[PDB]
Design a protein around this motif. Sequence first.
Motif, mmCIF file in Angstrom:
data_model
loop_
_atom_site.group_PDB
_atom_site.id
_atom_site.type_symbol
_atom_site.label_atom_id
_atom_site.label_comp_id
_atom_site.label_asym_id
_atom_site.label_seq_id
_atom_site.Cartn_x
_atom_site.Cartn_y
_atom_site.Cartn_z
ATOM 1 N N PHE A 1 8.056 -2.319 5.273
ATOM 2 C CA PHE A 1 9.463 -3.018 4.050
ATOM 3 C C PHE A 1 8.297 -2.616 2.681
ATOM 4 N N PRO A 2 9.527 -2.858 1.793
ATOM 5 C CA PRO A 2 10.421 -2.415 0.126
ATOM 6 C C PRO A 2 9.697 -3.529 0.090
ATOM 7 N N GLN B 1 8.745 -10.423 -5.679
ATOM 8 C CA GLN B 1 7.565 -9.396 -6.014
ATOM 9 C C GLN B 1 7.820 -9.414 -7.355
ATOM 10 N N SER C 1 4.227 -3.979 -3.448
ATOM 11 C CA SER C 1 3.502 -3.701 -2.983
ATOM 12 C C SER C 1 4.753 -3.408 -1.735
ATOM 13 N N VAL D 1 5.012 -3.183 2.492
ATOM 14 C CA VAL D 1 3.776 -3.234 3.527
ATOM 15 C C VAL D 1 5.050 -2.357 5.220
ATOM 16 N N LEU E 1 -4.238 -1.838 1.931
ATOM 17 C CA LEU E 1 -5.289 -2.629 3.324
ATOM 18 C C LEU E 1 -4.542 -2.951 4.067
ATOM 19 N N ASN E 2 -5.670 -2.462 5.073
ATOM 20 C CA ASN E 2 -5.937 -2.414 6.898
ATOM 21 C C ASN E 2 -5.964 -3.499 7.037
ATOM 22 N N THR F 1 -0.666 -2.564 4.330
ATOM 23 C CA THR F 1 -0.315 -2.458 2.817
ATOM 24 C C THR F 1 -0.843 -1.371 1.847
ATOM 25 N N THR G 1 -0.485 -1.470 -2.623
ATOM 26 C CA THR G 1 0.061 -2.364 -3.491
ATOM 27 C C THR G 1 -0.141 -1.316 -5.227
ATOM 28 N N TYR H 1 5.966 -13.593 0.010
ATOM 29 C CA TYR H 1 6.687 -12.597 -0.833
ATOM 30 C C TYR H 1 7.260 -12.470 0.946
ATOM 31 N N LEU I 1 -7.986 -9.720 3.273
ATOM 32 C CA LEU I 1 -8.934 -8.972 2.806
ATOM 33 C C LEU I 1 -9.278 -8.972 1.557
#
Lengths: 218, 9, 216
Positions: A122-123, A128, A135, A137, A164-165, A182, A184, C126, C173
Amino acid sequence: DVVMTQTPLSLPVSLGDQASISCRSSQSLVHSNGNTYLHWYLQKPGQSPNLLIYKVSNRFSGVPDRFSGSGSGTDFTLKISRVEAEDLGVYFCSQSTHVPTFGGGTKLEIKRADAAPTVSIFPPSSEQLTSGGASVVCFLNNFYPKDINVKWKIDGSERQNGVLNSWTDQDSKDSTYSMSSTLTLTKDEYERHNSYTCEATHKTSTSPIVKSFNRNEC
Amino acid sequence: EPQAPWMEQ
Amino acid sequence: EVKLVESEGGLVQPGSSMKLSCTASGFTFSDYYMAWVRQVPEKGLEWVANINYDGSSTYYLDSLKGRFIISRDIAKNILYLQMSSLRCEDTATYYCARLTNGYLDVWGAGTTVTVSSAKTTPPSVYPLAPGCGDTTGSSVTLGCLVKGYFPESVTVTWNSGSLSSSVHTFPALLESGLYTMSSSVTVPSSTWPSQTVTCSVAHPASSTTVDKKLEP
């Protein structure tokens, strides 16, 4: 200060097989009154601990005879016969003969056949981007075993920082895991590049699974 | 009777 | 039925105070000792305090230095934990529990206490929807990215909980002082966007609920 040491830290078991978990105390748990206050609790994913076995070997109400506790002194064992998927979670022992302390837990993992992840990318949302962030994902859903690697590339270049996992606990429904990755970035950096790729490496495939998009096509 | 055995003296 | 329900936890500044409560039902309250324990992140469970039937005798984890007070109201079936001079190290999930013959036979749901001088911040939520010219198969995976909040925790549901079977919720997290988590759901492609899908994100600490509709 009585230490409760559990082994192993994680235990994989096939459905219908037996699991055996060790709990050892740094001091005898035989109280002066003759009782041994050694207990076992189970914490299932997303739940509070529940009492399983009290005073070494006594099943709490509602616990089936598949669960058996044994031992004496400083050495104790929990045996779970005919394992069912819903048994998964963290088993921990505890003592209250002395100032009460808890073991660190043993995670019961249910074995199943290897299962490939379903990967979705996902863009950043327009919402956002309007707020100045970006971000990207990737969801990696319904795989086994738990070990899995995700690599992000931006215009072909690996990016490690900002990732971030997060893994779910094991799902009793199908014995699988899922994880979310994710990346970022700032909107500034996001808007300077075009190709966003997440590559999943898992034992179910020789070649990594690649999902990608191009920013100017979003 | 005791409920917190470690408090026994 | 027997049950224990903790009050809402949340954020407290270091050096400040706060009180947890726990309400019991289904048993004769004063017929049981009661306890608090806490689950500290990356660490194990730890005893905090316990109290006898009438509250005349209490026990505390030594390291507490008498900063905590356990007490009980027999008229109201309520257990209290007063916490004073809070430090970072007191950050944890607190559970109230019924204590019987040395073991904890009923546990509450747990409540999270975060000791920090950082500010309460609500989540940005989002939508994650397919696009970028990609094609559509027999199913679609949708999601919500929940970013920039503090403290823990948030709860995510889909369509006010009526969508649940194909949902994955991913643990939060901490990144740059704020939490990020996410959630995915899969539905048949013929049903979206025709049948609406909304992720609802509740964040008690900021008193905020976001109900974000997924759009193509």
